[PDB]
Amino acid sequence: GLLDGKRILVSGIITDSSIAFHIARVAQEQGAQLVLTGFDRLRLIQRITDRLPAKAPLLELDVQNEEHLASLAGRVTEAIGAGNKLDGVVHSIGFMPQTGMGINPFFDAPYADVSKGIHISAYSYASMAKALLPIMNPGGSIVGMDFDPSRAMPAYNWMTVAKSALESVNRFVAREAGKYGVRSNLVAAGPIRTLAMSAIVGGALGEEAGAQIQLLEEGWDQRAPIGWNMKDATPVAKTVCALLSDWLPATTGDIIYADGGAHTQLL
Amino acid sequence: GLLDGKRILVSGIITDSSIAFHIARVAQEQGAQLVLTGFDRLRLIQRITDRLPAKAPLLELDVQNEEHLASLAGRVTEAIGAGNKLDGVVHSIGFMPQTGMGINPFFDAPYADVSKGIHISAYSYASMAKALLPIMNPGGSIVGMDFDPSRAMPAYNWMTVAKSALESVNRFVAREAGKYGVRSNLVAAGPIRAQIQLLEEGWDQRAPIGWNMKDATPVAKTVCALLSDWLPATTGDIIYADGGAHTQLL
Amino acid sequence: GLLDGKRILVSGIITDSSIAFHIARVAQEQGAQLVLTGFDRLRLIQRITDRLPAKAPLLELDVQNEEHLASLAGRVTEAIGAGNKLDGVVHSIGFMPQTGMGINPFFDAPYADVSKGIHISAYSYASMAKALLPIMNPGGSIVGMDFDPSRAMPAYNWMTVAKSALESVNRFVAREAGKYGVRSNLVAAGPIRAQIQLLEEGWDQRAPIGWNMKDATPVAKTVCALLSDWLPATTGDIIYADGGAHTQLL
Amino acid sequence: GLLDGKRILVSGIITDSSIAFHIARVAQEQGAQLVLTGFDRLRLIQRITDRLPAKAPLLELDVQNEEHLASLAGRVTEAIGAGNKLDGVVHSIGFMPQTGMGINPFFDAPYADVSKGIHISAYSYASMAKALLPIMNPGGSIVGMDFDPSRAMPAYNWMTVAKSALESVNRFVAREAGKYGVRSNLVAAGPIRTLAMSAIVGGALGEEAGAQIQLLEEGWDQRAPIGWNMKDATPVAKTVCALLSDWLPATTGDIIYADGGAHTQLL
Ligand SMILES: NC(=O)c1ccc[n+]([C@@H]2O[C@H](COP(=O)([O-])OP(=O)(O)OC[C@H]3O[C@@H](n4cnc5c(N)ncnc54)[C@H](O)[C@@H]3O)[C@@H](O)[C@H]2O)c1
Ligand SMILES: NC(=O)c1ccc[n+]([C@@H]2O[C@H](COP(=O)([O-])OP(=O)(O)OC[C@H]3O[C@@H](n4cnc5c(N)ncnc54)[C@H](O)[C@@H]3O)[C@@H](O)[C@H]2O)c1
Ligand SMILES: NC(=O)c1ccc[n+]([C@@H]2O[C@H](COP(=O)([O-])OP(=O)(O)OC[C@H]3O[C@@H](n4cnc5c(N)ncnc54)[C@H](O)[C@@H]3O)[C@@H](O)[C@H]2O)c1
Ligand SMILES: NC(=O)c1ccc[n+]([C@@H]2O[C@H](COP(=O)([O-])OP(=O)(O)OC[C@H]3O[C@@H](n4cnc5c(N)ncnc54)[C@H](O)[C@@H]3O)[C@@H](O)[C@H]2O)c1
Ligand SMILES: Cc1cc(N)n(Cc2ccccc2)n1
Ligand SMILES: Cc1cc(N)n(Cc2ccccc2)n1
Ligand SMILES: Cc1cc(N)n(Cc2ccccc2)n1
Ligand SMILES: Cc1cc(N)n(Cc2ccccc2)n1
């Protein structure tokens, strides 16, 4: 398998539609031994991770919690065993309150909400790198999840702002990670219709919000020379696994686009 | 004059070395009538702005203060007279605590420091556009100050992260500004006054026409070019006033 | 005037709809004294340029003709008078045979067609800079015309490829221009007049301040802004005069 | 192996220092069945390809020759056998006469030399795609070799111009390739000291040219958070193999940087 013998920490599983759920699934299919981290609802997360091909210890991690971060390395060390290290780290954590993305006007998002969004979505990529680099093997790899923020797009609002910050954090994390022989990269994925986005499409935020996501999806599939299936996270999961492998050994501080080539085309 | 009869708001003057002092000075030289804003040290700022070629009312604005933002348009309206609107807005506001910018390791900047820095340097660009667009004329222009964050670099650290967020906020501000027939753009300047020195000195070497980090005038003139009617099809964009250093690898 | 007393060379006029005709017109309105260049149909071009606000000598220049290039500086020198130099040069020259641009499949453009297109649209930018830099004043400015080629699109095909090569040539021209204290920049314009129509109409929708493909004036004004002294720290760069369409995804 | 059962055409082998030689070597190590193409000196090329882990049919291909292009698909079909198709295409062909890159001033390169350089380096990426797409399987992959031309750099001159054109050609090739379910991408590599560059370092083009390449190499290794070894093409070869695999299935019309992360850093 592509990741045979590799010890990989994977964060961000909340539902079986989570991009992380599919990263974990494909990583296990490729012979990786995983350590999973979950936020808040750990009983629910355990029930979700029970749906994976194989068993994996599950650790609690709230990236806004300093105690969880200060203890993370020792907790990982305990789960994988003394004398062992992590070969890979997957950051698949993203959040922005409704006030910062959706139908709320861009100017009406309060800074508390935007700052919480940027803490979890951008700053936490450096926090996790800081906590895990000392327990990472040389040749190691850290992958974060990006959504192309190069051009402004309706609805995404402050989440697009958080992704621009994340892109910058990634290049600085690469400088630190390099000292440990570790690579740091982001995967910029096309839109994925998780349980949450399926509710917006249905109308949880009103008919205007639904139509906004319906138009994005259509446009993305049209633009992509190989097409784009919003319901399938496998292509994105495989790209993350490719960055976790030894098959992109000279790529760091960079962004790999798993978007069907949509960002390279105007129409 | 290039900005003849234009009413322009200029924020960010702290010393006569501030880029905003040079923007203010060049704008006044080009016939603009100014409204200035100052943070925290308003008596100190008034003595600095006395050194400007012409008189300009000075208003207080702490970008982290919601009361200052809610009252900003009304206060500028009093200062420029009822039935008068702004043609230009200059955002020359930036800050990052020392833990997130300089010799401090990147990983050791607490989030409260990074957030305060992002609030002032990036969020406030949208805050000032929200407050002032309702008192802006069509053909109007909003200009922000940027330091190229496309590549990582020593020392600038979390300020580079805030500039990446600012470039994103600018694209969204342009979307809102458009409805008012107003442009929103950033000026990416070269640095203005061992790892830091080599990083800084690399700008002159790299720049095909050179770079003088002691001369803020080329950057001030670029801001005024965006504030004029001479770039009317440019919005949500970045204009590099860096000697062309960003276009050369060596 | 913005270009008061400046001596500027303007190439690329063919009809009164040519972007170069509008650059010429705006430059003359801003006090510039022009020298024009024309290709192949010099009698036709003279009648078009009579419609300009002021008189300007017209010279022949086939960018594919080495003799025209070798004699260009000497001929401009006669036209502007001995001991006088150019302050500005406008390259508004482009061409791609129909096999490489439009309805023809991308793969069916023979290399001779693509090469002729690249020679005229990209190589000639370096050719004109080589010929004219020796007769340019410091503080001088060279401006080229670009159509954003960062993303592929229907129809433009091999012209998009030539624009990608032009953006690269511009960065190298800036390196040489620098020695003469001269700037080199491109203006990336939005399109000026079923797959093509949707591609074109998408500019207005995308542009936060809008886009009028019938009005070449915003692009002409942007060229003049680069030709002025108001963007003196910008070189080897691209200025987008496209309504800000390139900064918006939808 | 990563490319087990895959039929891949690899062009651009001239010496055992060629980036293509190492692409081929790593591809064979990963279970790929290769078809090689070579320009002009085919006896010499056969002697070089004899140094590879396994045997591979060798076809003649001069990308400036229309007859070689019109016959390429049928010649490949003959070598791999009736009923079989190509899964991958590697374009590793680049040329620019000395007048267009090195010590010659940028303005002194004649258009004939620049046009020849752009024909072989940029146009030929579309010519090969046009000739090989009809004999390519769905899920197929075409990879070309790029050298980051985003910023002007001394010495590279018109070769940097040719690479900017190639980057644009790649996005248009992706539009065509997509119709056949095929991906098209470029690998932007850091500098590799092939036999030719080793001669420039030694002084074949004068002392000024050598110092120019000596400064580039040093700067690239310093800038890269994981470092850069100009004498090693393996990291670049592995990245090309990663694009030839099914592990980057949603990436097309794009550029993957195998440069040690140098382009993401200023100093
Ligand atoms: N869904 C898309 O269309 C899309 C597209 C591109 C990128 N992404 C990115 O992919 C990543 C995964 O998101 P997803 O789309 O799978 O949605 P998701 O809701 O399934 O996953 C995001 C995760 O963030 C976690 N999280 C939130 N706050 C946290 C905290 N304080 N501490 C720790 N974890 C916390 C949640 O528990 C959840 O597991 C995110 O970075 C997201 O921004 C999503
Ligand atoms: N000097 C450089 O090297 C350089 C280069 C590129 C961009 N810039 C940018 O130019 C702008 C001005 O920088 P400068 O070099 O003139 O420095 P400066 O110190 O003169 O200006 C920064 C200004 O921000 C103001 N400010 C801080 N906190 C504030 C708050 N809460 N509310 C309102 N105003 C607040 C300060 O009072 C000060 O006037 C900033 O956006 C900066 O990031 C500077
Ligand atoms: N119109 C648009 O949609 C648009 C958009 C962006 C950029 N541009 C660019 O603007 C420039 C002018 O385009 P335009 O729209 O005004 O079209 P145009 O037809 O008016 O101008 C092109 C000019 O190139 C000249 N030319 C052709 N071959 C030549 C040669 N061998 N030697 C010298 N001159 C030669 C022609 O005589 C003509 O005047 C070109 O570089 C074009 O690519 C056009
Ligand atoms: N060497 C570097 O530092 C470096 C860096 C980045 C990218 N590249 C690119 O990698 C690719 C391979 O180059 P390399 O560095 O291995 O050098 P190389 O000399 O070993 O390979 C280039 C190949 O181009 C072939 N070629 C030239 N003209 C041809 C024609 N008419 N028809 C067919 N083939 C022709 C040559 O025969 C040779 O095999 C090129 O695209 C090059 O531009 C090289
Ligand atoms: C870019 C993007 C799209 C989606 N769904 N996410 C994750 C997320 C989770 C919670 C709130 C907001 C966003 N990120
Ligand atoms: C990019 C840049 C350079 C400088 N001096 N600034 C402003 C600033 C003000 C206070 C603290 C930190 C930074 N921004
Ligand atoms: C980008 C663009 C659009 C137009 N009209 N041009 C000039 C041109 C002239 C002749 C043939 C083809 C193109 N360039
Ligand atoms: C970018 C780059 C570096 C090297 N050596 N090449 C290949 C090449 C082959 C012949 C002549 C010129 C260049 N491409």
Numbering used by the authors:
A (entry chain A), D (entry chain A): 3 to 269
B (entry chain B), C (entry chain B): 3 to 195, 213 to 269
Provide the authors' original text about this structure.
Isoniazid (INH), a successful frontline TB drug for more than 50 years, targets the NADH‐dependent 2‐trans enoyl–acyl carrier protein (ACP) reductase InhA. This is a key enzyme in the Mtb cell wall synthesis pathway and does not have a human orthologue. InhA inhibitors are known to modulate the tertiary structure of the InhA protein binding pocket, in particular the substrate binding loop (SBL). Herein we describe the screening of such a library, in comparison with other fragment sets, against the highly validated Mycobacterium tuberculosis (Mtb) target InhA.
Crystals suitable for structure determination were obtained for fragments 4, 9, 12, 22, 24 and 34 bound to InhA. However, the pyrazole rings occupy the same sub‐pocket, stack against the nicotinamide ring of NADH, and the 2‐N‐pyrazole provides an H‐bond interaction with the 20‐OH group of NADH. Fragment 9 is more potent in the biochemical screen (pIC50=3.4) and its 5‐NH2 group forms water‐bridged interactions with the NADH phosphate group as well as Met199 and Thr196. Introducing the amide FG results in movement of the phenyl group of 9 to allow an additional H‐bond interaction with Met98 backbone CO.
